[PDB]
mmCIF file of C-alpha atoms in Angstrom:
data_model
loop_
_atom_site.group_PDB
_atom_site.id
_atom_site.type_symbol
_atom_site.label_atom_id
_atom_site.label_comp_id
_atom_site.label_asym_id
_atom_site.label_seq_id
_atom_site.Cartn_x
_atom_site.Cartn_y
_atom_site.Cartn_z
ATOM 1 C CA UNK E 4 20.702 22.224 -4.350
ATOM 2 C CA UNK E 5 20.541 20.895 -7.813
ATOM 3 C CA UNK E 6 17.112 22.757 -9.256
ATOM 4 C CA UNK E 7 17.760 26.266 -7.488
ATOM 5 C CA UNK E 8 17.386 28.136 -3.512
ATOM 6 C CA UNK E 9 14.957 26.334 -1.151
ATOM 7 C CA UNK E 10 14.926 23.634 -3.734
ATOM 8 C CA UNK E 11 15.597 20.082 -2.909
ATOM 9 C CA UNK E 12 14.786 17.371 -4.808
ATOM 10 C CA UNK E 13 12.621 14.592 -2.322
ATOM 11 C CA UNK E 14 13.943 11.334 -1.976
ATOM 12 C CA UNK E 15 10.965 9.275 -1.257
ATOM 13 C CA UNK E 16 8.398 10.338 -4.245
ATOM 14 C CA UNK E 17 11.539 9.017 -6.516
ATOM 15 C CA UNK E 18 11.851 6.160 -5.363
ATOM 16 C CA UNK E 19 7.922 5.708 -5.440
ATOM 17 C CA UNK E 20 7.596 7.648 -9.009
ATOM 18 C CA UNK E 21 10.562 4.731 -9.977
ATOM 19 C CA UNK E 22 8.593 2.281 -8.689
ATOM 20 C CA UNK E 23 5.505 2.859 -10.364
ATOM 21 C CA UNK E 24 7.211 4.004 -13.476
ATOM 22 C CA UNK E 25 10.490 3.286 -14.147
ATOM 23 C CA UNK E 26 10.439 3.814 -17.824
ATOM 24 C CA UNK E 27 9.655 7.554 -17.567
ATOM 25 C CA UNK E 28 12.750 7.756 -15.348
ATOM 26 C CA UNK E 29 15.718 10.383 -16.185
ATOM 27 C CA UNK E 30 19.471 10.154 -15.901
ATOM 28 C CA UNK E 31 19.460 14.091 -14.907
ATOM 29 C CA UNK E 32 16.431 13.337 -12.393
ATOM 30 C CA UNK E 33 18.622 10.459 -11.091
ATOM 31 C CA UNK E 34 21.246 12.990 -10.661
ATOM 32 C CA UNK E 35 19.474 15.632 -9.016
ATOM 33 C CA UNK E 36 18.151 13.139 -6.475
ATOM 34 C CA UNK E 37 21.612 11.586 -5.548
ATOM 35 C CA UNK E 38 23.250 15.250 -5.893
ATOM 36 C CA UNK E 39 20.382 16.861 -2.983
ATOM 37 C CA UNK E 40 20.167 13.864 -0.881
ATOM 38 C CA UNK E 41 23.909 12.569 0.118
ATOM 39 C CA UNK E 42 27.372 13.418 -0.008
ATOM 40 C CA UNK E 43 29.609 11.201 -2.355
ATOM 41 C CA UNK E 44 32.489 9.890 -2.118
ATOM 42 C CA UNK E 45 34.592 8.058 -5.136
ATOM 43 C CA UNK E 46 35.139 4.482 -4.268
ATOM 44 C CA UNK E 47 36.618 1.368 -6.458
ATOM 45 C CA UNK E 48 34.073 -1.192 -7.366
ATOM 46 C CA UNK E 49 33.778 -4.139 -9.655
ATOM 47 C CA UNK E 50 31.007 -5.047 -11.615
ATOM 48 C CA UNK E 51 30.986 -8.121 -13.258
ATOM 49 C CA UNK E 52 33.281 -8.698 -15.845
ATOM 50 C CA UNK E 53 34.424 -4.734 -15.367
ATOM 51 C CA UNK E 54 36.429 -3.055 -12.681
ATOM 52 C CA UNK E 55 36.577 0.743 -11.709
ATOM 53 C CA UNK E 56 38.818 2.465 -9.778
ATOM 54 C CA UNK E 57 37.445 5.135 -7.279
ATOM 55 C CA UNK E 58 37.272 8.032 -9.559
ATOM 56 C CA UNK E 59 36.546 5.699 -12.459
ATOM 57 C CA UNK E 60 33.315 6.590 -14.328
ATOM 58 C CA UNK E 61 31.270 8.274 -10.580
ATOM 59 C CA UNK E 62 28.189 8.268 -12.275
ATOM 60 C CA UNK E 63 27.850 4.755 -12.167
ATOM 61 C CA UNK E 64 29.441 4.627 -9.230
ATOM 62 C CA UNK E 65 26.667 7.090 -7.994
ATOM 63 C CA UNK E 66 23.774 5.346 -9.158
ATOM 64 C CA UNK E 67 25.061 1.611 -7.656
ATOM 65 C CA UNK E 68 25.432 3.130 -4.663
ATOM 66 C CA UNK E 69 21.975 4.629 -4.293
ATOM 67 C CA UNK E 70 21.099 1.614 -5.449
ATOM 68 C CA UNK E 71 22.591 -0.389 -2.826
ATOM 69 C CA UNK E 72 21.275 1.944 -0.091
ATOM 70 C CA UNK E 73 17.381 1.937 -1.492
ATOM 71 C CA UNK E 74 17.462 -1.407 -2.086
ATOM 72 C CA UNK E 75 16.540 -1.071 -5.615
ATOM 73 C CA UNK E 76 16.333 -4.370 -7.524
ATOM 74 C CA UNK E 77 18.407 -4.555 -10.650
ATOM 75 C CA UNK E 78 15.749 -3.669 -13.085
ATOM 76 C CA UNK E 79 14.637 -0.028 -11.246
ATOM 77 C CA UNK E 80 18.745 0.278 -10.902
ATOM 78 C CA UNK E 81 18.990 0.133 -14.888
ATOM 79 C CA UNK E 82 16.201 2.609 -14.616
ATOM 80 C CA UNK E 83 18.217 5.199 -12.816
ATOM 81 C CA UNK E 84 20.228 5.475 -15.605
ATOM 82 C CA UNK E 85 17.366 6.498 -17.361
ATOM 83 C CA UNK E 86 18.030 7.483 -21.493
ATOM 84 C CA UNK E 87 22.053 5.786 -21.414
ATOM 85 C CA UNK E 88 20.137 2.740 -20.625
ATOM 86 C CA UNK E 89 16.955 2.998 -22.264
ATOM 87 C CA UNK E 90 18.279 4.570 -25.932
ATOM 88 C CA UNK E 91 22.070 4.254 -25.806
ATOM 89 C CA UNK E 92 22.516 1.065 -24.781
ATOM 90 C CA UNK E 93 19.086 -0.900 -24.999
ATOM 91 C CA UNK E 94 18.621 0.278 -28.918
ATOM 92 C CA UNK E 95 21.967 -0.441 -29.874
ATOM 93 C CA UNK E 96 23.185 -3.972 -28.185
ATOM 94 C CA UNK E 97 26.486 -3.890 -30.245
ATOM 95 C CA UNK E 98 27.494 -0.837 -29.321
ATOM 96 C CA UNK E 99 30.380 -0.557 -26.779
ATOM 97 C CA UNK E 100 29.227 2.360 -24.539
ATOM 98 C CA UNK E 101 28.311 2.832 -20.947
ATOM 99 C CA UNK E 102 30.291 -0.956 -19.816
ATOM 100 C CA UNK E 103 29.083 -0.628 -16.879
ATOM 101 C CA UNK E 104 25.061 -0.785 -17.918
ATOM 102 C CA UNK E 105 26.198 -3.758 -20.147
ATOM 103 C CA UNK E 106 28.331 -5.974 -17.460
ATOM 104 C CA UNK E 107 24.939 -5.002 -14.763
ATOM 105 C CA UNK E 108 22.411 -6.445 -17.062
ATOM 106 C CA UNK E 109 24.245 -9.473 -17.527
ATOM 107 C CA UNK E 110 25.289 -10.064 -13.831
ATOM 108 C CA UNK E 111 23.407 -7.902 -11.720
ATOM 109 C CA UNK E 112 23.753 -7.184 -8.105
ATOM 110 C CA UNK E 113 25.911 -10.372 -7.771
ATOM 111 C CA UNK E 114 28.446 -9.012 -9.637
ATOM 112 C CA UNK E 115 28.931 -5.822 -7.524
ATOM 113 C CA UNK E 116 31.451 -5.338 -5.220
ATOM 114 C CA UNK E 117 32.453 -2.271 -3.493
ATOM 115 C CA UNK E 118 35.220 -1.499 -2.034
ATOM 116 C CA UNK E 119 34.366 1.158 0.153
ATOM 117 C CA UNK E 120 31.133 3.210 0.616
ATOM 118 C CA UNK E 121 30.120 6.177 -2.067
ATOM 119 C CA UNK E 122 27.265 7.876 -0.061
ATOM 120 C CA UNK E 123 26.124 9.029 3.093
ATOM 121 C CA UNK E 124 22.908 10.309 3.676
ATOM 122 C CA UNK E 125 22.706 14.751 3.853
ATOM 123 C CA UNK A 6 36.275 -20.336 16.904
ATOM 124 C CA UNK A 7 39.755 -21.372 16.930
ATOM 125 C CA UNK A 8 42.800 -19.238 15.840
ATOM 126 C CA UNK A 9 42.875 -18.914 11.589
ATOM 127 C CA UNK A 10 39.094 -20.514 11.831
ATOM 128 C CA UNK A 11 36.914 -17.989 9.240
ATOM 129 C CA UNK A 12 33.410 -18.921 7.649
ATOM 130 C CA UNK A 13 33.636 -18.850 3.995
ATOM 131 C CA UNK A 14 30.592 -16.629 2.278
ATOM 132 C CA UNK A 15 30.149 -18.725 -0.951
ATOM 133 C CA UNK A 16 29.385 -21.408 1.253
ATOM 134 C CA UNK A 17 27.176 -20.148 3.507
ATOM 135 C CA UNK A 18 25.365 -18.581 0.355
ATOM 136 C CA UNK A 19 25.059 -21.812 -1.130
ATOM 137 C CA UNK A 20 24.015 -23.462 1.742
ATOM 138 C CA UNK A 21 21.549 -21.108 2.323
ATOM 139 C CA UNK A 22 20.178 -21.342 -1.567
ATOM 140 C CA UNK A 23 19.674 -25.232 -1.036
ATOM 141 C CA UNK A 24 18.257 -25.379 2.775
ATOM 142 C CA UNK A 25 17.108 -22.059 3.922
ATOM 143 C CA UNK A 26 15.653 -23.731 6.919
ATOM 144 C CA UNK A 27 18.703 -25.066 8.122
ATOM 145 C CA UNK A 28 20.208 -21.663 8.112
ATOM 146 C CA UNK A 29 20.276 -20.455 12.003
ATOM 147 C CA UNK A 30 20.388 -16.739 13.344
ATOM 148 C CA UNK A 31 23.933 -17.846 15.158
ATOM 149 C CA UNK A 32 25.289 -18.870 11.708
ATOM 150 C CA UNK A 33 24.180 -15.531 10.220
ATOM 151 C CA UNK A 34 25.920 -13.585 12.572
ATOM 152 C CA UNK A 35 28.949 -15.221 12.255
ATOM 153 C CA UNK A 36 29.462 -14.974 8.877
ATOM 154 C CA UNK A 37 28.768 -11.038 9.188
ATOM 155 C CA UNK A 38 30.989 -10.473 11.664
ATOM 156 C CA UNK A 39 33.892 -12.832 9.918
ATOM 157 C CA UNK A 40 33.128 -11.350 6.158
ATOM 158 C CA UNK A 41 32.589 -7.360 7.222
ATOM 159 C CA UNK A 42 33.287 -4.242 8.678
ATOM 160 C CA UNK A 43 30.102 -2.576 10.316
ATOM 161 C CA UNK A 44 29.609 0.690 10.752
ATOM 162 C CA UNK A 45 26.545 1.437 12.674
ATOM 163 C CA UNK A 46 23.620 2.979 10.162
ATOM 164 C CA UNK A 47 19.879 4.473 10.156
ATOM 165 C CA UNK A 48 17.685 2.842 8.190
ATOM 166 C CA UNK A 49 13.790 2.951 7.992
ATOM 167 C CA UNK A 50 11.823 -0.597 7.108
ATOM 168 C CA UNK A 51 8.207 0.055 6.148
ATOM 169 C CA UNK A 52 6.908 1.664 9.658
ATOM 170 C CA UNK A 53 9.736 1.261 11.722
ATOM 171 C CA UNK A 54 12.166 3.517 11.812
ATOM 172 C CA UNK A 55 15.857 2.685 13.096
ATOM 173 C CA UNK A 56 18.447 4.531 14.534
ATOM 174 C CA UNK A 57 22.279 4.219 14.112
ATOM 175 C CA UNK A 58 23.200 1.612 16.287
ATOM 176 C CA UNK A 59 19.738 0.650 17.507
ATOM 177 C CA UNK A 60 18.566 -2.769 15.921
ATOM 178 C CA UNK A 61 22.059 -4.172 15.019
ATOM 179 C CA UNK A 62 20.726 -7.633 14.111
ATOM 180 C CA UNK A 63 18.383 -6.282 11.557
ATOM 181 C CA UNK A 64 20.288 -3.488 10.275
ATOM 182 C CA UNK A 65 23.295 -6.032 9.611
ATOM 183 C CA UNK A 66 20.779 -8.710 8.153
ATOM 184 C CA UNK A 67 19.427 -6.330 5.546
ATOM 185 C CA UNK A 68 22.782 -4.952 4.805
ATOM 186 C CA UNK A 69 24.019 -8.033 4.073
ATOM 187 C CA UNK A 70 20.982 -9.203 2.278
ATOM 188 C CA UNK A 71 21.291 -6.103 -0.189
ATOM 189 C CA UNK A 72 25.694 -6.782 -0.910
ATOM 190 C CA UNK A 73 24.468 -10.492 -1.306
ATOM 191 C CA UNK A 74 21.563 -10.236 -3.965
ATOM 192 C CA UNK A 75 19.114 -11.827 -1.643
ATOM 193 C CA UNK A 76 15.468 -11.455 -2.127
ATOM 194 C CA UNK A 77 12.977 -11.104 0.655
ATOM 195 C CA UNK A 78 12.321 -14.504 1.396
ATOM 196 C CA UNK A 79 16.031 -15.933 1.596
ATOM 197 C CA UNK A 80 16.732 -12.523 3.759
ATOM 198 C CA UNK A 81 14.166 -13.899 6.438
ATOM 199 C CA UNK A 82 15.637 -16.746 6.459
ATOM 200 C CA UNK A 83 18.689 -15.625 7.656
ATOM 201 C CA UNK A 84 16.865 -14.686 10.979
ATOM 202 C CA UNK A 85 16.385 -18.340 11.340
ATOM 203 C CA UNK A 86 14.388 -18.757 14.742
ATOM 204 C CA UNK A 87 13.053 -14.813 14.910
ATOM 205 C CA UNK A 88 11.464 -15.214 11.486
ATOM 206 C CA UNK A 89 9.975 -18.826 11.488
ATOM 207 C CA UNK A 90 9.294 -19.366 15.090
ATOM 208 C CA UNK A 91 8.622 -16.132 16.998
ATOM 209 C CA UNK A 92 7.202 -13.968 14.356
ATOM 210 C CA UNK A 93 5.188 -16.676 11.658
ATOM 211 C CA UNK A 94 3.726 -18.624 14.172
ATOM 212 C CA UNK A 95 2.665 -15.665 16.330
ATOM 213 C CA UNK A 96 0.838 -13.245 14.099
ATOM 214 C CA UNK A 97 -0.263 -11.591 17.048
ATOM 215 C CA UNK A 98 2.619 -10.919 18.838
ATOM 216 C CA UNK A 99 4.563 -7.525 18.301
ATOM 217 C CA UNK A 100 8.052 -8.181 19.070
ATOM 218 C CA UNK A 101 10.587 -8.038 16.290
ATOM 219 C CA UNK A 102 9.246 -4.913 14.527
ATOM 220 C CA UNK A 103 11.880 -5.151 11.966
ATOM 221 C CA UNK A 104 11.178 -8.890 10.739
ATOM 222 C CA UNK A 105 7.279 -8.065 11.144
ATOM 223 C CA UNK A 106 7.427 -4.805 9.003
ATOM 224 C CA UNK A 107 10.532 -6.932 5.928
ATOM 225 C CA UNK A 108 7.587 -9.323 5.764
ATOM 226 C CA UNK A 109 4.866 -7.101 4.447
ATOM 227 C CA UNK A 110 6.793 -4.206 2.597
ATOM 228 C CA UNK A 111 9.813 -6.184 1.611
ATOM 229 C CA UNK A 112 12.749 -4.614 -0.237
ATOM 230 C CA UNK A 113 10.935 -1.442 -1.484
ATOM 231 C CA UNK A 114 10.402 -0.226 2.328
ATOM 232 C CA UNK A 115 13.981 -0.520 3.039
ATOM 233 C CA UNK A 116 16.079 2.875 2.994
ATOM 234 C CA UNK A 117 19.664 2.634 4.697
ATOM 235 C CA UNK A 118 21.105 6.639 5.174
ATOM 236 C CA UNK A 119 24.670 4.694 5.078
ATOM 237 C CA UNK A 120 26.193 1.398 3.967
ATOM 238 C CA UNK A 121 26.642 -0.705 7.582
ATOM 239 C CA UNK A 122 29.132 -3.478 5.831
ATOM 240 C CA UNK A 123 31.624 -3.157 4.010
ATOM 241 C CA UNK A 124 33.232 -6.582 2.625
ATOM 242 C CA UNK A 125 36.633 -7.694 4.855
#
């Protein structure tokens, strides 16, 4: 478990606290959520004007996936990624960081294709 | 049918943008099966909770919906009859749970424990 013994992050008051408020959202709660709740596999996807091989940048990867899964629309997806979308990338639109947040908010869920499947369910 | 014979996605996308209520469950299906592998998955929907491999219609609708973008209103459509016959005209009939339950919590009641299509 992510946090410690006994520990496990739950899924479903995430996806409600994300739902409620996305904006107070974390990358490293994110994380601890995906981490405690499924196993992950790497797998190729595209996203827009951006490709990434299976092993290519698995945080995004991670969060897609989850989002795919949880039906998350595209806005609470760009929420997952908490502070790298909020700060790094939202602050600083000419900045060249975090491609994958960039090509997402321009073409969304349309633009995603996976390969393969990331996550399974623990 | 016939031998080389495949439905085309953007099309049937399309076609479903411009005249959901053309779109029937038969067509829906057949796309699916000619555009994916499925792999039987869980999923809960509001109240209803599925097994893997029990409620393949709706578990491969909603899959589908979710790898197409689809919002809730063009993913009822692709149940075509189900939705606008069976379930809106007969509020107070309980047969297709899954439909029933989509309708009222939508997207944010939908929780898949594995991805059921993968693109062909």
């Amino acid at each position: 478990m992510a946090l410690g013994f006994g520990m496990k992050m739950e899924l479903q008051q995430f996806l409600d606290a994300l739902a409620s408020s996305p904006e107070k959202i974390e990358f490293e709660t994110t994380m601890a959520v995906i981490e405690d709740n499924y196993d992950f596999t790497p797998a190729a996807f595209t996203n827009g004007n951006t490709q990434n091989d299976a092993n290519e940048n698995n945080g995004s990867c991670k969060i897609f996936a989850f989002g795919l899964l949880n039906a998350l629309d595209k806005e609470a997806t760009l929420a997952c990624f908490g502070r790298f979308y909020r700060e790094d990338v939202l602050l600083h639109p000419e900045n060249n960081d975090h491609q994958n947040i960039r090509n997402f908010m321009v073409t969304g869920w349309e633009g995603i294709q996976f390969e393969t499947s990331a996550l399974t369910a623990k």
